[PDB]
Amino acid sequence: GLMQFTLPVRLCKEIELFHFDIGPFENMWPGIFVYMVHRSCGTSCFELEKLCRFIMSVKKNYRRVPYHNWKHAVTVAHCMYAILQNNHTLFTDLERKGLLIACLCHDLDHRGFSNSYLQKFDHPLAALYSTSTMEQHHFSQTVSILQLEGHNIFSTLSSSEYEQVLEIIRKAIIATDLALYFGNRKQLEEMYQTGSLNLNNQSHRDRVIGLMMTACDLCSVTKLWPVTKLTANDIYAEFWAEGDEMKKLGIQPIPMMDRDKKDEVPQGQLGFYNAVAIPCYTTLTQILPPTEPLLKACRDNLSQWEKVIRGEE
């Protein structure tokens, strides 16, 4: 009730910045998350006992894969926190509650494989969920954990507030399917420019929350260069394992997933910043001016990938 979470001074300060790294101390990650909910949402959003038990069940249902792990979940939630704190007055009480939870839960029980590989392997999830296969799974795992005895952190919301929050979380999690992102950003691009973007239109909020989700999910490209470069090693460690598995099914993987194209990583990173990252943070900054530090950090890391291609590092 009177029990604030504090962080050591360097974290207490650096956690407010977009580029904050949550560090290698796994055991501090829960407290970092609780700290961020408490400042973002207030100390009264969740019963602490329930929140702690929910965080620990979420943790247990992330797998020890090189990239889509518990560290990624808490990274994507810290970026959402940064966005929320810098756009204080644009979001509802329920949106602040829901989105930090959505981000912690967005990759629950990920196996290190793309929706594509699940479809070619003919994994059972691919017959339960024909598109956004893993993302429909992540949402389903969220609801499961919320239904555990003692884990309903939303148990004080009205019957209809509860339904609104689970609907924000579902759309938020589905929007992390990067196949949906391209169309979502194109439509936001058009509506912003033609002046039709309206934050009272619920379907517009949805789009804008979807772009925030993609921005948070891609936030490794917005870190200090050494964080960005070492996270790319984890990202390709999964992709290349998937490439291996594709070759086991008799299928040439795409170059992104072929470890025989190690040499081309720098140029693949350029494609990705140009096709995906920069456009994402550009459109995000237009709609939400105070997120510009994500665009500016992303541009910095593109320029570092340019330097790598030129032998300069």
Whether 68 is catalytic:
yes
- Give the single-character DSSP code of 275: I
For residue 107, state whether it binds Zn ion (rule: CB under 5 A): yes
Q: Which residues, including other chains, have CB under 8 Å from residue 285's CB and lie 6 or more apart?
A: 291, 292, 294, 295
Name which of residues 206 to 225 contact ligand IQF (CB under 6 A).
218, 220-221
Cα angle 23, 37, 172; round to 5 = 90
Name which of residues 223 to 252 contact ligand IQF (CB under 6 A).
232, 235
Options 34-42, 94-102, 189-197, 267-275: segment touching ligand IQF (CB under 6 A): 267-275
- 21 carries a ligand binding annotation: no
Closest to ligand IQF by CB, 7 or 224: 224
Q: How far is the CB of 59 from Mg ion (least distance, A)?
A: 17
Q: How far apart are CA 236 and CA 67, in angstroms?
A: 9
Smallest Cα–Cα separation from 256: which of 243, 275, 274? 243
Closest to Zn ion by CB, 36 or 197: 36
Q: How far is the CB of 282 from ligand IQF (least distance, A)?
A: 16
- 304 carries a ligand binding annotation: no
Q: How far is the CB of 105 from Mg ion (least distance, A)?
A: 11
Do residues 283 and 189 lie in contact, with contact meaning Cβ atoms separated by under 8 Å?
yes
* One character per residue 170-209, x = contact with Mg ion (rule: CB under 5 A): ------x---------------------------------
Closest-approach residue to ligand IQF (CB): 268
Closest to ligand IQF by CB, 204 or 259: 259
Do residues 48 and 254 lie in contact, with contact meaning Cβ atoms separated by under 8 Å?
no
For residue 107, state whether it binds Mg ion (rule: CB under 5 A): yes
Cα angle 288, 271, 80; round to 5 = 30
Print the SS3 string covering 155-220. CCCCHHHHHHHHHHHHHHHHCCCHHHHHHHHHHHHHHHHCCCCCCCCHHHHHHHHHHHHHHHHCHH
Name which of residues 144 to 183 contact ligand IQF (CB under 6 A).
178
For residue 103, state whether it binds ligand IQF (rule: CB under 6 A): no
Closest to Mg ion by CB, 191 or 241: 241
Selected from 14, 21, 206, 264, the binder of ligand IQF by CB under 6 A is 264
Q: How far is the CB of 160 from ligand IQF (least distance, A)?
A: 34
Smallest Cα–Cα separation from 164: which of 212, 97, 81, 216? 97
Select which of 38, 68, 110, 138 is catalytic.
68
Smallest Cα–Cα separation from 172: which of 200, 205, 194? 205
Q: How far is the CB of 76 from Mg ion (least distance, A)?
A: 9
Do residues 300 and 268 lie in contact, with contact meaning Cβ atoms separated by under 8 Å?
no
Phi/psi-derived region of residue 81, left when phi > 0, alpha when psi is between -120 and 50, beta in every other case: alpha
Name which of residues 271 to 290 contact ligand IQF (CB under 6 A).
271-272
Catalytic residues: 68
Residues that bind Zn ion (CB under 5 A): 107, 217
Residues that bind ligand IQF (CB under 6 A): 178, 218, 220-221, 232, 235, 255-256, 261, 264-265, 268, 271-272
